[PDB]
Design a protein around this ligand. Structure first.
Ligand code: FES
Lengths: 221, 234, 9, 55, 401
């Protein structure tokens, strides 16, 4: 997948849009242009239109495979339906690799290695979606540090703000603290954020952490 | 789009319109504010998202626990088109047309309806076929050509039904995002035809006992006759 | 030459 | 026998422990080495070998 | 007094004065007849109340009108039955087409791809089974098609069978007509090979009973001594895996008896000896197993299977001194060790609280309560409470009976 991404980087960069807001407006304008008279690697920003067409989107998380890969196997089984998509992040892959190479639990290590293999195969076949580090830079807030959890929640907030009709589920371990962003991932009482900052196009994506609306629109399944 | 017809679904369903209902809706499951009693604000992206995602999983969609179906598989998409053509045109009529323009008005209208239905089905299945080109199979691509022939639609290789785009002024067409509309249907179908021809060529090159000899002979004869009928070579 | 039939005539 | 109950008032019993012990219990078992049937420890068959030696 | 509706279907209580009613023991409800009323319908012929009017017009139409046929039509239908040879040829053609068009499994990395369901293969399989008098296992076919090598070894055999049948050869039909002697023909050999491939797929899947049945059908078809020996060896192995020791031993003995009719190059005789020895070992007769292995070695010295089995028996013999003898003749078969035996016990095992000797007892063809069981006059048996019908006292005890 690394070699494929390097080969197909130019197409991905050309297809990635300039602005990440008013995505619905941009899609409508593209549709109007089309109405008026091969396949590269699938990534979120280049394939936003594909994601918009898709009905369900599962965001992968490293903690999901703390013990077994059954849930990831279920997600990839759901993938070929054509109506569902899977989103994996570079931060998620990094977390999987580091915890497979360092976690004291042998079950966790083997499960994470198997998950890496499965994700690699799915990306190779193109049925999955990848969010490289460059796209993470483009998407994440201006000057916000993002780990796996923060990157996952920024992706969820972007999908909920620019592609509302796509139903966003999150695959993660029930013990993970990222399941409740407004309870654990919160920057304190900030006067510049409110419950409507999720829908505020100009506001940073992470402002949605302070409110339950992000959790309202994102389902942990 | 979650609870209703999605990407490759054939059934046309307007989720906002309460069609296919025997009751006047009294309770709206997806409600965010009490004001939505008299101002539901349906159509707005966020509230419509809430309502549609609150809708239960119908037959088209599948629950998170129920095992889904690989609808995006070429080996399933092609036989779907073949079955569509078979249902549209009866075996007797297909045999009569192959033997043979002297046809009954009912039979002519049946053929036209079959061609229209096949075109609509191709339009609906186009994204799935495009996604499944990569891992398709030679038998299924030959079946694609056979299904087109049976439906009697000549693919636009550059009667004929794909070559002419559907009527409608560009200022009124449904350009709304999230709906799998293919405005450039003839161009997309021509690209798909070229891609499947190239895929067949690659599969034959990769492939290059009595059973296997006979299989190769029949496959070559089929490929030849079907491509000749559709106006393609190699 | 006879068989048991459910109904006759 | 004085007032109707609501779903949560009915679900109090499943919240309790007696309901779980009476209804929601899983039995631990194993395959008998002799008859190869599911078997719970402490209970055996009437076969001669089972009676003589009790798996 | 009156609390609910006046109709009998109303729930709450009523009183005789206000809402007098007839004695309706049990009648259907608002949502249609229930299982209890339908049991009454089938047993007594009408609902227990008796006020209902029996009405089985639909049942009559389903059964009697459908099965009614006049004498002349019944006589001419047999003569107008279809052509068996052409029907078999068409069945083989469509079955081969369906198998060939069956998609190949994608070899995914990191997990096991689900094998595509076989929807269109069943009807061709059903007609092929009907025509050939054989029964193919859907699980076996699924496994054969999923495996790439087995898929080719099945397709080639099926194509050969089709070619030889189209060439005018129907060995089973010709043999049956002649019987109404020779050796196995090419068509019959191809059919046997196809059935053996299906059985191998069944064994790979884990359906040893289906494998054994398919191999038994193949044995029925075959007539050559070498084919008989090979099929007997295969059936013995299948029965060993399926936990059918008597069948395994019988098939192994038959193969070892057919040994002389087979050429030296074949190994079916050694396979049959190995199967017989394994059946003896599972029956826990180590002396018999060792003797059989010794005979097999004396026959074919150097056989890998015989050497492996001899080594295993030697290890068991070295372990035996711990017991100082063999398993006592008292049990001689008690221990169960096969996954097939475990599955059989899970399925047909007498469950706790039902399907036991205390829940229902199966008489000749009927279900009885434990108290009416004619196999034991236990303390819960009605037979105990009878005694001294009038002929003679019949028992010394003088307290009951
Ligand atoms: S064999 Fe299992 S209880 Fe006796």
């Amino acid at each position: 997948v690394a070699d494929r991404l390097r080969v197909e980087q130019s197409v991905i960069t050309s297809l990635i849009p300039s602005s990440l807001r008013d995505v619905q407006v941009q899609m409508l304008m593209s549709n109007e242009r089309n109405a008026l008279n091969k396949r590269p690697l699938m990534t979120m920003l280049s394939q936003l239109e594909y994601l918009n067409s898709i009905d369900s989107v599962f965001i992968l998380h490293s903690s999901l495979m703390a013990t077994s890969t059954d849930q990831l196997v279920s997600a990839v089984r759901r993938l070929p339906s054509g109506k569902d998509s899977l989103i994996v992040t570079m931060s998620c892959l990094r977390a999987l690799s580091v915890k497979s190479l360092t976690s004291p639990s042998m079950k966790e290590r083997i499960a994470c290695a198997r998950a890496l293999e499965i994700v690699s195969y799915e990306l190779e076949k193109g049925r999955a979606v990848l969010l490289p580090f460059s796209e993470e830079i483009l998407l994440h807030d201006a000057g916000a540090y993002c780990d796996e959890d923060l990157m996952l929640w920024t992706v969820a907030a972007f999908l909920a703000r620019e592609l509302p009709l796509v139903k966003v589920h999150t695959l993660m371990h029930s013990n993970c603290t990222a399941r409740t962003p407004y309870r654990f991932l919160k920057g304190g009482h900030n006067l510049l954020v409110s419950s409507r900052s999720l829908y505020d196009k100009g506001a940073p994506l992470l402002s949605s952490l302070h409110s339950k609306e992000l959790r309202l629109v994102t389902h942990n399944v | 789009v979650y609870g209703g017809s999605g990407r490759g679904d054939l059934l046309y369903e307007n989720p906002d319109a309460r069609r296919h209902s025997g009751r006047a809706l009294g309770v709206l499951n997806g409600v965010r504010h009490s004001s939505q009693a008299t101002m539901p604000e349906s159509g707005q992206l966020y509230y419509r998202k809430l309502i549609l995602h609150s809708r239960p999983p119908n037959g088209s969609c599948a629950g998170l626990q129920r095992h889904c179906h690989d609808t995006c598989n070429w080996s399933y998409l092609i036989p779907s088109l073949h079955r569509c053509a078979e249902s549209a045109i009866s075996a007797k009529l297909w045999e009569k047309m192959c033997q043979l323009v002297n046809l009954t008005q009912y039979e002519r209208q049946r053929v036209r309806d079959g061609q229209n239905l096949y075109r609509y089905e191709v339009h609906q299945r186009l994204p799935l076929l495009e996604e499944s080109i990569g891992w398709a199979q030679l038998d299924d691509l030959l079946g694609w050509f056979r299904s087109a022939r049976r439906a009697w639609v000549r693919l636009p290789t550059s009667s004929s039904a794909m070559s002419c785009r559907l009527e409608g002024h560009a200022d009124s067409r449904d350009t709304t995002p999230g709906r799998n509309q293919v405005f450039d249907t003839p161009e997309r179908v021509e690209q798909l035809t070229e891609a499947t021809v190239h895929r067949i060529r690659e599969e034959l090159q990769r492939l290059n006992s009595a059973r296997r000899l006979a299989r190769d002979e029949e496959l070559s004869r089929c490929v030849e006759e079907e491509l000749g009928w559709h106006g393609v070579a190699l | 030459a006879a068989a048991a039939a459910a109904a006759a005539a | 026998p004085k007032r109707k109950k609501n779903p949560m008032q009915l679900r109090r019993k499943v919240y309790g422990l007696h309901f779980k012990e009476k209804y929601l219990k899983m039995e631990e078992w194993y395959y008998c080495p002799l008859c190869a049937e599911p078997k719970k420890p402490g209970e055996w068959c009437r076969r001669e070998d089972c009676r003589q030696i009790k798996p | 007094y009156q609390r609910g509706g006046w109709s009998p279907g109303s729930k709450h209580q009523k009183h005789m004065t206000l809402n007098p009613t007839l004695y309706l023991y049990r009648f259907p409800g608002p949502h249609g007849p229930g299982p209890y009323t339908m049991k009454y319908w089938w047993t007594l012929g009408c609902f227990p109340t008796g006020m209902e009017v029996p009405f089985r017009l639909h049942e009559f139409l389903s059964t009697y009108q459908q099965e009614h046929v006049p004498v002349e039509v019944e006589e001419w239908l047999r003569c107008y039955i279809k052509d068996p040879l052409s029907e078999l040829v068409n069945a083989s053609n469509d079955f081969f087409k369906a198998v060939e068009v069956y998609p190949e499994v994608e070899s995914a990395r990191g997990y096991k791809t689900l094998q595509p369901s076989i929807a269109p293969l069943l009807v061709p399989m059903k007609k092929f089974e009907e025509q050939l008098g054989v029964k193919i296992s859907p699980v076996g076919l699924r496994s054969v098609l999923s495996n790439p090598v087995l898929k080719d070894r099945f397709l080639d055999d099926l194509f050969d069978y089709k070619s030889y049948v189209e060439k005018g050869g129907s060995t089973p039909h010709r043999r049956l007509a002649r019987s109404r002697a020779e050796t196995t023909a090419d068509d019959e050999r191809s059919l046997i090979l196809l059935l053996t491939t299906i059985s191998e797929g069944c064994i790979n899947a884990g359906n040893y009973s289906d494998a054994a049945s398919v191999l038994a059908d193949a044995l029925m078809f075959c007539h050559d001594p070498d084919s008989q020996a090979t099929t007997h060896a295969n059936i013995s192995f299948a029965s060993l895996l399926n936990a059918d020791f008597k069948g395994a031993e019988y098939n192994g003995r038959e193969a070892a008896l057919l040994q002389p009719q087979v050429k030296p190059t074949s190994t079916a005789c050694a396979r049959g000896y190995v199967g017989w020895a394994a059946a003896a070992a599972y029956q826990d007769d180590f002396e018999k197993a060792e003797a059989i292995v010794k005979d097999g070695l004396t026959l074919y010295v150097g056989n890998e299977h015989l050497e492996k089995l001899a080594n295993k028996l030697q290890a068991l013999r070295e372990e035996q001194p711990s017991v100082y003898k063999q398993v006592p003749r008292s049990l001689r078969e008690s221990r169960s060790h096969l996954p097939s035996q475990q599955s059989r016990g899970l399925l047909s095992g007498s469950g706790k609280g039902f399907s036991n000797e205390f829940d229902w007892v199966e008489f000749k063809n009927k279900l009885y309560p434990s108290k009416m069981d004619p196999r034991n006059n236990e303390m819960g048996s009605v037979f105990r409470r009878v005694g001294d019908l009038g002929s003679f006292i019949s028992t010394s005890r003088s307290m009951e009976r």
